[PDB]
Design a protein around this ligand. Structure first.
Ligand SMILES: Cc1cc2nc3c(=O)[nH]c(=O)nc-3n(C[C@H](O)[C@H](O)[C@H](O)COP(=O)(O)O)c2cc1C
Length: 169
């Protein structure tokens, strides 16, 4: 598969989202699904297209497995890659740090030469601050299973449709 999806998860939500994204794209032959806990930073070199999934924990921190590999990201040549992002969060309980992890990863990876694609509009959300917002859009798909579980299915389908174009599908 030419698209590699790497996710990290504490309670399983981001994994569930990752599986739905893969299925939406068309399955295993279209997207490779990988838990970043089992990966090496160099594994990211194999793809032209990447999807990065990461929930925000402990008031604005990266999920643990992403935190562990964070410093090794500098060794990956992101030049020429197109990268999309998704994250799970809680806009009510963490209004001032909603989806911060997604924003932190995007900032690091884009500065290494990749092009971010898959921007998502902020309509329908209610939060005060987020490190994942640029030009009044989220840098990736913001999922909130804690407060908006009913919006998830549709958010994923719509986001994947738009991404397909960018990934030459
Ligand atoms: C103690 C705690 C701290 C959290 N901190 C944040 C946060 O800073 N920002 C945010 O958007 N969501 C935060 N959340 C919400 C989680 O990201 C959310 O529950 C998500 O679904 C967890 O995904 P996971 O199962 O993939 O780890 C927090 C959740 C808990 C229980």
């Amino acid at each position: 598969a030419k698209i590699g999806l790497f996710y990290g998860t504490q309670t399983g939500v981001t994994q569930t989202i990752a599986e739905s994204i893969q299925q939406e794209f068309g399955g295993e032959s279209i997207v490779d699904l990988n838990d970043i806990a089992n990966a090496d930073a160099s594994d990211l070199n194999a793809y032209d297209y990447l999807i990065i999934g990461c929930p925000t924990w402990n008031v604005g921190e990266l999920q643990s497995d992403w935190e562990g590999i964070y410093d090794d990201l500098d060794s990956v040549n992101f030049q020429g890659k197109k990268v999309a992002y998704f994250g799970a969060g809680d806009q009510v309980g963490y209004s001032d740090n909603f989806q911060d992890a997604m924003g932190i990863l995007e900032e690091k990876i884009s500065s290494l030469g990749s092009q971010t694609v898959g921007y998502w509009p902020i309509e329908g959300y209610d939060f005060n601050e987020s490190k994942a917002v640029r030009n009044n859009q989220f840098v990736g798909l913001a999922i909130d299973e804690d407060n908006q579980p009913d919006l998830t299915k549709n958010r994923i389908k719509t986001w994947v449709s738009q991404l397909k174009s960018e990934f030459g599908l």
